[PDB]
Design a protein around this ligand. Structure first.
Ligand code: ZN
Lengths: 116, 266
């Protein structure tokens, strides 16, 4: 095959992408990966360990922790919540796959507590 | 106002997204209808644009059923009623039982004969597109210093007990007890609520005194001990008629959680 090996073979791809929602996705993934507890390191990694159980699929996240991470991100999640929510779920899925024991078809959910 | 409906979300801008290629577009409401795109501009697939309900934009709307005032009725006639519609920023400003001078546009709209058929009845249903409400029956450091000076007045206790119920005669200790009830004890089981019982013949001043004093305090309630009471003493569960779902209708004793409950014919 030539270097032009892609006729768009079998593609019905997304011709446009939600920029705000995907920025929220990556920044929330960074928040889950980097926000740390005072009595240790990386709180939500430890809390996400519990999601390998068959019944557990929801990670409960503190909105004030998100604000302590970054105010612009928290404001965007609060203002654009329903728009960005499945993208946050994809961020959690990307974060929790590193436990390596999850079923491939399992859905994961984010749940924001402590809204001021 | 007889009844006031739930807050109706009324659409004002329809958000469409292509199921194939995620291209999005927005279209204004024309006259309640939507000009659905029929083909996606970024991939030309027909019937591929889908309405995303929660990405669309909505305004507030509410239905209010208004009855003519009793004095305005003709002799012995049953009430006429009109339907009102109040939109964004004017939506939830009236409650059932209150009185209003309401200004609006007298609309007339067709009503369809059946929900699945576009034929309309020749007789148009009418309603008021509300523009303005005016409630007609609802109605500082200077106050603080006036009250502080008045507290030092001699026999202020007797003064306030005499100010209670001017129409009622000679019942000094009864009014004094009612005053102490209305002030109440110190909150903090350490119940601070003072309980008072009036006892006497029918037709005497006690019923008038109760009907007076219940409106003299915030959070107050008045009800009958009989089954004809509008709001009962006991909590109960009923089907809310406008939606036919269960609602926990609490009693007067619970609605007066930090006020006086006046129980007549106790
Ligand atoms: Zn498209």
């Amino acid at each position: 095959l030539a270097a032009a090996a892609e006729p768009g073979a079998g593609s019905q791809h997304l011709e446009v992408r939600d920029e705000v929602a995907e920025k929220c996705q990556k920044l929330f993934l960074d928040f889950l990966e980097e926000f740390q507890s005072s009595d240790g390191e990386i709180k939500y990694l430890q809390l996400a360990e519990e999601l390998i159980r068959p019944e557990r699929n929801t990670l409960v996240v503190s909105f004030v922790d998100l604000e302590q991470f970054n105010q612009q991100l928290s404001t965007t999640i609060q203002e654009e919540f329903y728009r960005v929510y499945p993208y946050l779920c994809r961020a959690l899925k990307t974060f929790v796959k590193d436990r390596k024991e999850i079923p491939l078809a399992k859905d994961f959910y984010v749940a924001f507590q402590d809204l001021p | 106002v007889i009844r006031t409906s739930q807050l109706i979300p009324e659409m004002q801008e329809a958000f469409f997204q292509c199921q194939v290629c995620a291209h999005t577009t927005r279209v204004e409401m024309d006259r309640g209808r939507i000009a659905e795109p029929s083909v996606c501009g970024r991939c030309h697939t027909t019937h591929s644009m889908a309405l995303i309900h929660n990405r669309s934009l909505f305004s507030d709307k509410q239905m209010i059923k208004l009855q003519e005032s009793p004095e305005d009725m003709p002799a012995g006639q049953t009430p006429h009623t009109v339907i009102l519609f109040a939109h964004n920023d004017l939506v939830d400003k009236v409650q059932p039982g209150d009185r209003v001078n309401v200004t609006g546009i007298y609309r007339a709209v067709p009503i369809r004969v059946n929900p699945r058929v576009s034929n309309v009845k020749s007789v148009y249903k009418t309603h008021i597109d509300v523009i303005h409400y005016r409630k007609t029956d609802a109605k500082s450091e200077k106050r603080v210093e006036l009250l502080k000076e008045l507290s030092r007045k001699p026999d202020i206790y007797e003064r306030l007990a005499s100010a209670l119920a001017p129409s009622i005669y000679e019942h000094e200790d009864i009014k004094k007890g009612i005053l102490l009830q209305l002030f109440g004890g110190t909150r903090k089981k350490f119940r601070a609520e003072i309980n008072i019982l009036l006892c006497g013949d029918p037709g005497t001043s006690k019923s008038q005194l109760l009907q007076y004093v219940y409106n003299l305090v915030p959070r107050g309630q008045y009800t009958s001990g009989k089954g004809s009471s509008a709001v009962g003493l006991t909590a109960y569960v009923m089907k809310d008629p406008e939606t036919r779902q269960l609602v926990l209708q609490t009693g007067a004793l619970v609605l007066s959680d930090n006020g006086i409950c006046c129980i007549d014919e106790f």
